[PDB]
Symmetry: C2
Amino acid sequence: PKDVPGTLLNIALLNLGSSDPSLRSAAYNLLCALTCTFNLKIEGQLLETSGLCIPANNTLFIVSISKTLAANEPHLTLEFLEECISGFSKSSIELKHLCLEYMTPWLSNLVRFCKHNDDAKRQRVTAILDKLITMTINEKQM
Amino acid sequence: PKDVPGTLLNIALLNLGSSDPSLRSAAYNLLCALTCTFNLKIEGQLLETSGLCIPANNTLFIVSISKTLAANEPHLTLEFLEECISGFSKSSIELKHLCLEYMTPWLSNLVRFCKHNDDAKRQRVTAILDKLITMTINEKQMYPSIQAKIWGSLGQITDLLDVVLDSFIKTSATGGLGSIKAEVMADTAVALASGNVKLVSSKVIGRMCKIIDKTCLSPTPTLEQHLMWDDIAILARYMLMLSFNNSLDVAAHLPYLFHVVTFLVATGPLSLRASTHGLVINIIHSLCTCSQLHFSEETKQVLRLSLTEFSLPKFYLLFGISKVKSAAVIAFRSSYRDRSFSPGSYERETFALTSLETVTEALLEIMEACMRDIPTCKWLDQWTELAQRFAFQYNPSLQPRALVVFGCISKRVSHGQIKQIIRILS
């Protein structure tokens, strides 16, 4: 589990915007564990709880967390985007609109990895770019 | 033609993103005539021509023109928006996404017309806001984007909250308690309250305290039978949604939030009683994770233990939602945007004033723990004043509950007060 902090972070954010009230609460608890275990620096404070009522409208709250971790936690970028794009194709139309909202703040971090001494990381950004090209071709309504 | 520059401009921009190359060229030329006739100040230069080849991908070009005219041509705002929304409903899905892109910059200009000397212009901005509410209800696939674009920005405009909030309540009132229009407007305010947490909360609480205070004019045997029950039921769903993530600003409103809870514990349909339990859980959770307050490490342990007690089966009984596995499931419904829930099981349990003591004495402990680390706190004095005002006034639906609370949180009593209590018994 300590080798994939970026993979679990996408599962937490994606399911915070769900339409099932129980599914939101468990997603909030998962996000609290990471911020403690991995010492991730977020803006506010979080506390695990049972019985929370989390509103269905959660777009702006999710983006604030995503927009903050991206600014001051760049080393999750490659794991996050590879998983964020993968979850894009497995979700419904309404959730497809959400992933675009909190995905964009991370695209700006690909600069740090574009010329990373050809350490096979440069070979991965080219893989990420290929995924974005596939989405553009298929989704004609958005 | 000189009386409707705003209406012609929307036809130009909307058709500039068509999928037909011939239609795109006609749109470019029409946009050039407007800029010449009306001397509109755009960034670049334009020139009419025949035979231009215009790419189908044109979003960023269209938005730049709209984003500029909005900044330095405000006098088109009321004509443009009225026509932009109207053509929004006549277009296909793909074009609908474009209308949101270049519509957003024009919303900031409504400040200049909100208080325009009641010249019937104030009557139009309220008309426009009604149209936006109608769009939000119908288009459910674009919902995550409308919140972050339309309602997200309007929250940050301080001068416009009062009018925007006012229209929200009226729309919900017509629908009714379980209506769709009321459920959306309750869930939509969360986006609105993000920009100004303090101003939106004080207004929603301000209105809830006054409606209860106005039940004294026409007393009724119970609160539900009153004529203002609907106005108090929908406004409770607004507070439920704003409680999460400390959007009610507990740091300055705690005395009143406890005050409303006591008058609402265990009253109404099972879906409303599950909301009052959830509201308390969210308020306590907000105290623990609030930064404006500096609680000692000892006190935080007191709150965290209380946060667990309220979820025990003992307290599900006090709030009247026994036989319920989880309150969160009952409070919310997945199909709120689709249909309107039909209330059932009109049979409702009776409430005993001995249960109101146990709840009213668990909350008092919570408040006192917080007052130790807050110098010169006035939470308890403010709460006591509200209790007095309702204890010694005739209202068959509220007076019994105010008396039970008044003797529980009061720290002093004089002969005169003890005289009035006996007189009430007489």
